[PDB]
Subunit: 274 residues, 2 copies
């Protein structure tokens, strides 16, 4: 399972492998993205989760000090300016200078060598959102020689918006195909121009596509919960309903809203007037 | 198939609003009220049961899952837990304090 977390209007993917920072940035560039950026303390947690679930696949196979390439490098030319929170570095995907940092040990005042930054992680200790991964500069490396403890990288993608996960009212499996070739079945948010192949049963095959229903509005096009089986009704996952699940017949149902709320066109999600 | 959604051509909701729930019609359009105890439900132009209800039977009636009397915070025995909820949402609609389910059986 490919490690991916999509939050807000951006996504984060973590891939293992000994690639130099030039090959890693080129890999993220192929899928229309760039190496991850730890601009805010919130992005730190998001990038720390895609790594956490990547290591959880093979933590014993990765060194106890793991380095994961991110999109921060200071090309050769001028020395770091300590006063800057980013230490004179620049995000590989462009942008401005962020006030958040997490440097470890001490940076080398080499104004003649280009140096890339990876995220260091101590895998002997449990991973926690409080003990956020520390930053480590060093040689960017070459093809075949990525560097010491380099065992992966993190690509960050950006989109105009995100859809919501398809709510199922019965037994089924949905496979969300993101724009980048990563396809997952457990996406907390689905980006624009993504395909979802619902496999209703335990066998119907439904397909939907994240489309701009309106400015800053993204919808698949489905109405009501999917995979609904009369054998279960509201017993199974509350019929995939936002809050209330009205009963009717033997297995028929329809999502309901508590007084004051209002059901939307999705026939599932509730929203209050005020 | 069914006719297109016509908001203006929707029967205006109760002036106090549906005090149980809220949903669309059978065709998936317009607002509708959740059917209370002993209300038609099931198969075009149908309504669906409230929470804690079952549509015992084409179309039947909504009976409470809790078919046993209960004792509430109002110091009054109710016919069922469903009637305690139905009268409780009225209290908040008219500003009165919410009627809570204190115990079951009768009110000592």
């Amino acid at each position: 399972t490919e490690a991916v977390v999509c939050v807000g209007t951006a996504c984060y993917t973590a891939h293992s492998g000994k690639l130099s920072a030039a090959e890693a940035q080129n890999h993220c560039n192929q899928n229309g993205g760039n190496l991850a950026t730890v601009k805010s303390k919130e992005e730190a947690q998001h990038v720390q989760r895609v790594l956490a679930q990547l290591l959880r696949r093979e933590a014993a196979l990765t060194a106890r000090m793991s380095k994961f390439w991110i999109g921060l490098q200071r090309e050769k030319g001028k020395c770091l300016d300590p006063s800057l929170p980013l230490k004179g570095f620049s995000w590989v995907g462009g942008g401005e200078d962020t006030p958040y940092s997490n440097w470890h040990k001490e940076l080398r005042n080499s104004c003649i060598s280009k140096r890339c930054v990876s995220l260091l992680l101590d895998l002997s200790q449990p991973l926690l959102p409080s003990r956020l991964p520390k930053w480590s500069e060093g040689p960017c490396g070459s093809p075949g020689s990525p560097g010491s403890n380099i065992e992966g990288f993190v690509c960050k993608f950006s989109f105009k918006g995100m859809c919501r996960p398809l709510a199922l009212g019965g037994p089924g499996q949905v496979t969300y195909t993101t724009p980048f070739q990563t396809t997952s079945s457990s996406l907390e948010a689905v980006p624009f121009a993504s395909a979802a192949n619902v496999a209703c049963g335990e066998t119907q095959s439904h397909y939907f596509l994240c489309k701009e229903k309106a400015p800053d509005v993204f919808d698949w096009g489905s109405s009501g919960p999917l995979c609904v089986s009369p054998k279960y009704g509201c017993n199974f996952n509350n019929g995939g309903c936002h809050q209330d699940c009205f009963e009717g017949g033997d297995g028929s149902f329809l999502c309901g809203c508590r007084p004051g709320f209002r059901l939307l066109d999705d026939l599932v999600t509730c929203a209050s007037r005020n």
